[PDB]
Amino acid sequence: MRTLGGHPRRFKLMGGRPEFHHVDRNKNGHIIEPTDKFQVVITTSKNNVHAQVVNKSRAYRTIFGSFAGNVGIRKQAQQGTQCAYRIGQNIARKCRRLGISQVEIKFRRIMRVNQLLQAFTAHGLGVTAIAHEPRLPKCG
Amino acid sequence: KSLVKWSATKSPQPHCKRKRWREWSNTYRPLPWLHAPRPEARDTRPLLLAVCKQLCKRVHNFSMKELTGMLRAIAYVDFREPAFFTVFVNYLKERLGEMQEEDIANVTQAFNKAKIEEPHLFSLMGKRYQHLQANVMAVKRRGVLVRR
Amino acid sequence: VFYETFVLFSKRVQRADIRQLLKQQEALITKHHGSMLAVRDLGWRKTAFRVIKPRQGIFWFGRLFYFSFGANPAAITEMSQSLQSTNGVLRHATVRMKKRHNLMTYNHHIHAR
Amino acid sequence: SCHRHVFRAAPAAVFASVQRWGRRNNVHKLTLLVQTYEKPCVKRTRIAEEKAYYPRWFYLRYATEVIRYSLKHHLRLGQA
RNA sequence: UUUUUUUUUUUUUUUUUUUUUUUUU
RNA sequence: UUUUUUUUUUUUUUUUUUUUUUUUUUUUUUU
RNA sequence: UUUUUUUUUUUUUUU
RNA sequence: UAAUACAGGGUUGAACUGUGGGUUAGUUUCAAUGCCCAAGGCAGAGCACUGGAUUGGAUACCCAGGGAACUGUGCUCCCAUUAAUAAGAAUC
RNA sequence: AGUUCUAUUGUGUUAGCAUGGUUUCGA
């Protein structure tokens, strides 16, 4: 009982600090500037799926990310279609908190890339361009 | 706009981590003839405060492209007057839609240089800049590929 | 028989080095009963992608050179290995001289009509 | 690698174009083959079988086009 | 040493030391 | 475990020839 | 927590 | 399987030659994989082997570890034995 | 059928090079 959609390990370390406290800042002390570009790199797999945010205005520096274990989904429930959909919602909801509107989308595979795209358009996170760079082997 | 350029020299100071590494920087020549008074002349006010006083009195006559340049230049002579920059916060919020892409880049530099951290205005400016940049595609090691 | 070689220099290559390089090469030619044909230059060339050569750095462009010669067929291996050891030279190739297709007798009316 | 820009188009419409791009280059087929090790003997027979089925599909695809084209126009050819 | 993202009164301007180490706003 | 970057070592069939178009030119009675 | 399975375990990381 | 060196085969043009041939031991080269021996190593894989599953009563199926085997001028042809199940001439 | 000459070369052998899946490193 008492289920929570988060990471139990991180919840135990809570001490009342606000959000975005451990993230490093810049010289000016601003977490993010109005002039910036983002490109989320999504990687799919059989059981789990990861999607981290990469900032192109900071020499490709990561800001935050999420996984199946950060939404309260474990065991075989991750293989279900809801696991991908829930992860996308968290990214879209968290995007509005930082103050970003337009974020690019990048992925290597096309297997679990349908639930994430649909969830982004249901909150406000739009899509400006789609990038696909499959690193297919060039040798036997 | 041109005064700041004259009083600026590009140098390559040593890096913070590795002293062998170099990073290009900017150094501005100090001015010792703009802050002092002029008791001899009738106008006892200095040359710097006089420009600011007239600018705020006739802000409406200036266009958007003509406003960010003048504000960006005042902060480049070490003008630590947060009250001066706090008058334009209400004027800019009501005219955010009429702001060009160049205007965004010419206004953030001013507040940051003077150590004026404003979250209610910087949060709104982020959306405007991204919306304008919604029609330009740029890739890595190739540049801008598709524009509009 | 006749042979051709295309050498791509770097930005870090002065005129001093180019003269030295060519002089060294001529030694081998003469050794094997040969003679130089002609030396020409092609100027600078833009590179499609960045070149990452170890212990050399990263470059985006270079100076393309061309020189024709003739010697024994066994001299190709000696020449090829010498270029690789020398600095400045990031990429090179040796192409045999053909009868019709060549950079000597056939250099006009390529792109036009 | 493929890159597309969204301009006055819905995300769903744009996403339908990149999906078909992989089929031409067989991106999906090559991705799965490398994941698992396939014996050389199996590839010997699989490579030959694909050279007889695919050609037949092209001929049948053209036949279906004539049926749809003629259905909307009626008429019929004969030994005239 | 390597350069990442932009504009057009100019060859101009910001950033800079490896990231990420939490849901509902 | 994900992302990013800048030069160590082993290995070398992904792309590139084709509607099987000679009198169709060839495979074995019957069920 | 990660990986893996129809499902699960072993194994690995420790502010 | 881009470049270069050595030497073969196939298609077409000229010259020369003027029946040179088919099959082939008491013969001679090459010949996948496995095994003996030898050389070896610092990648990607895995037989044997106590390393986490079985059953409606027995198991190698599904993960992970794992010191044999994987480049040879050699010893050497057991097989589902390498481009159909005839090496040649005549009738299109 | 065979020899010589000429055009043609993803057929045998071949040490350095370029690119790439995996792997490896973190002033």
UniProtKB/TrEMBL annotation, chain A:
<protein>
    <submittedName>
        <fullName>Ribosomal protein S11, putative</fullName>
    </submittedName>
</protein>
UniProtKB/TrEMBL annotation, chain C:
<dbReference type="GO" id="GO:0006412">
    <property type="term" value="P:translation"/>
</dbReference>
<keyword id="KW-0687">Ribonucleoprotein</keyword>
<keyword id="KW-0689">Ribosomal protein</keyword>
<comment type="similarity">
    <text>Belongs to the bacterial ribosomal protein bS6 family.</text>
</comment>
<dbReference type="GO" id="GO:0005737">
    <property type="term" value="C:cytoplasm"/>
</dbReference>
<dbReference type="GO" id="GO:0070181">
    <property type="term" value="F:small ribosomal subunit rRNA binding"/>
</dbReference>
<dbReference type="GO" id="GO:0005840">
    <property type="term" value="C:ribosome"/>
</dbReference>
<protein>
    <submittedName>
        <fullName>Putative mitochondrial ribosomal protein s6-2</fullName>
    </submittedName>
</protein>
<dbReference type="GO" id="GO:0003735">
    <property type="term" value="F:structural constituent of ribosome"/>
</dbReference>
From TrEMBL, chain D:
<protein>
    <submittedName>
        <fullName>Uncharacterized protein</fullName>
    </submittedName>
</protein>
